[PDB]
Amino acid sequence: SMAFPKRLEYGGHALVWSGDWSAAGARKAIAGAARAGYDYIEIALLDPWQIDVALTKDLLQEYNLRAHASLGLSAATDVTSTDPAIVAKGDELLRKATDVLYALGGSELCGVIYCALGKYPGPASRENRANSVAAMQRLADYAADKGINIDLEVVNRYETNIMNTGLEGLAFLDEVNRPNAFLHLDTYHMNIEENGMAKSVLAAGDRLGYVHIGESHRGYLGTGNVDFASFFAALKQIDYRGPITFESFSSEIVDPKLSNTLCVWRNLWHDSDDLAGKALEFIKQRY
Amino acid sequence: SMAFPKRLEYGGHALVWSGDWSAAGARKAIAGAARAGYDYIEIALLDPWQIDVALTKDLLQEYNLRAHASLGLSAATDVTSTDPAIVAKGDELLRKATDVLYALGGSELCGVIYCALGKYPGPASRENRANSVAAMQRLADYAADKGINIDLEVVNRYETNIMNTGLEGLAFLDEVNRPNAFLHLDTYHMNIEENGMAKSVLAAGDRLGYVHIGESHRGYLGTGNVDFASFFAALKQIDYRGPITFESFSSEIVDPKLSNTLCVWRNLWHDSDDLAGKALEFIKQRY
Ligand SMILES: O=C(CO)[C@H](O)[C@H](O)[C@H](O)CO
Ligand SMILES: O=C(CO)[C@H](O)[C@H](O)[C@H](O)CO
Ligand SMILES: [Mn+2]
Ligand SMILES: [Mn+2]
């Protein structure tokens, strides 16, 4: 068991272009990501059964584009649950997601894979956390057979009760104790929870395996409150060489299964291409 | 008719010291605010029927302290509801809170007074917004007879679907069209939703009636990401002369119902006096 190769590469989140993964939606997102000049598309596998693999393989080939995958779990698939029937549903979704990612020749399963994405009605018990750590052990081991790293995305208090800072994320990963399990940081969530935009990156070092770039309000990069200068300087200091996906959500493009959960009440952009294009330039200028 | 006098004065949120307003909790919080050097205490009126008003007035006299009030409504008192019985409950609580604030000699009712504080399942309908605007018209007119201004606190996407930016708040206040209705900004909520920390303040000018100071993670002022230098520069430029309350919420002090609502999963402070004391020094040094 070991970590699978990572490279400095730039990706666009599928929801920048498409709210579904129909033949049309898949192509819109892949074509968009390719058009803006990204190395990969990040597919939202919130329902990995809805994904036509052959179709997707063909599109990625057609546009000379690589794929990674992210998801959140839901109440019905929450691996922190003290109901083992719900944890089993979680393990199953995570296996299927991995199977799909393997069929597409992808190497990264990231996002909120360790709990239900959304507002918890109270703080996590030690048992909620232990349930989550075990589930990520079973996932990392399943993934390892298929040349896939998992990257646990730290998100803000409103989207998980398990880990809200990189430091918390790192301590969680110590317990997972798997070589193909990494920290996933997102500048949007960091903007809320972190003591500056450097502390968690510098602590993480080689354990930082994935990055999401989002503005404070998840709109155009450079129109919000995120100190990107301080963040990217930290990446340079640890010489980060892994996926970097631009992520943004507008009511304009809505997945029913994500948009209400992320409380995307506001339209912060309408031109996917203009947003994605400016974002990659903004990112590449700094890293 | 008219708006009531505002002065530049510094406030401590009662919830920094006490989770309740028992005689002991009230005494503790008022003595705390006075000890830290604040001009007033901001009393949480989530349940204004549970306040002993004569006791509170005696305490405020005893410690030579003024009082303003903030609250959030809940599902059962949501003035945005399409259930007129629920709106009626909201009107009733808002009237009661105004009565309490009036008897206490206060002039400012602020916070999430226009909707239920928390995660909405979907975006706000035209009805939801119109119901809210009408409720704030009835409240503003009721408060006008009692020399009280109302200030509508703009909160982040996870805490309301009605208004997430200062600009949205100003537009909502245009429809309310009451001289004693003002905008209320909170740096914690601005840190997520705003295009920088100056814009909403410069646009609001004389319509900014109330300010909450919160760090990005709601911990010690200056250990987070909020560009306070840029915010206070904006306050200076419009010569803001209104209440400035420091707030933060510890799961060790507040009611489990509120800490769960605000997703306080960790505590970045334990010493109420040290936090509140240092918070005021931080504020008074910049404004
Ligand atoms: O930031 C996120 C949600 O706020 C993550 O990117 C999600 O886990 C991922 O996009 C799943 O949609
Ligand atoms: O920022 C706030 C909520 O997060 C407001 O201060 C509260 O809604 C209000 O003070 C009630 O406690
Ligand atoms: Mn993300
Ligand atoms: Mn506030």
Numbering used by the authors:
A (entry chain A), B (entry chain B): 0 to 286
Question: What does the published report state?
Answer:
Here, we report the isolation of a novel protein from Methylomonas sp. expected to be a putative enzyme based on sequence similarity to ketose 3‐epimerase. The X‐ray structure analysis of l‐ribulose 3‐epimerase from Methylomonas sp.
MetLRE is the first dimeric l‐ribulose 3‐epimerase identified to exhibit high relative activity toward d‐allulose.
